Symmetry: C2
Subunit: 119 residues, 2 copies
Amino acid sequence: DTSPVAAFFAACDADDLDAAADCFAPDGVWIVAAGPEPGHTYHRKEIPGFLAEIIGKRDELDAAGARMVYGDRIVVADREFLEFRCESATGEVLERGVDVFTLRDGKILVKDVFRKAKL
Amino acid sequence: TDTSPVAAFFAACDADDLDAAADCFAPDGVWIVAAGPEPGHTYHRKEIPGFLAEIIGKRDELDAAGARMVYGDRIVVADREFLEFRCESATGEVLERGVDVFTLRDGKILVKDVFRKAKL
Ligand code: NA
C-alpha cells in the first residue's frame, strides 16, 4: 500500500509529525471544516503547527476516555474518502465527518474535511 | 440518464417530480442533514417529502437571486456514491459547500448523509 493517506495516518499513530507533514504535496493544503471560506485552508507551511495542535487534542480526548472510530478508507482514481467519528466514553458522538483527499504524484494535494454539526 | 437512484433523484428534482424524487429512497431510507442534535438530523422516509418541499423552495429563491449549485462528478464505489456540491453567488462567492455520501441498497438510496463546511 503506497497511499500517502495510509502513510499519513501511520505517521500520526507513531507521533512522527515530520513524516506526516511530508505526506502532503509541496503545494498541498488541509482545509478544515469551519471558517470563513466556508472552511479554512491551511497551507503547507501551516500544517506542522496544526498537526501539533490536533495531536495534542487527540491525546487529551483519549485521556478523557474518548476514541476515534474510522470507516473504511475508500480509493477511486486520485481521490480517497474516509468517514470518522469521535465517541466519548459513554458512546456520545463528539464529532462526525468525512475526509475527502485529492492526491497527485503520490502526495496529498488536498485534505478537505466536512462535518456534521449541532444547532 | 443513469439508472443509479442518485442520478434518478437529481433528475426528478430538476423535473420538479418530487414524488419520483422521494421514491428514489428505500422504504427504510433516511436523509441525514448536516445540522442537528445527533450531530445531524435523520429524516425518515415518511418525512422526506415534506423536507424535500422546503429545500426546493430554498433552491428556487436562491436561483432567483442569481446563485447556482455546482456539483462535482458522482464518484461510484462499493454500495456508495460521493458527490461534492457548492452553492455560488452570481459573482462566484461561495455560499455553501459540502459533500453527500450516499449508501445504496437494491437500487434505492438507503442513506443520504450530508456533510458541510461551516462559517463560525
Ligand atoms: Na447508473
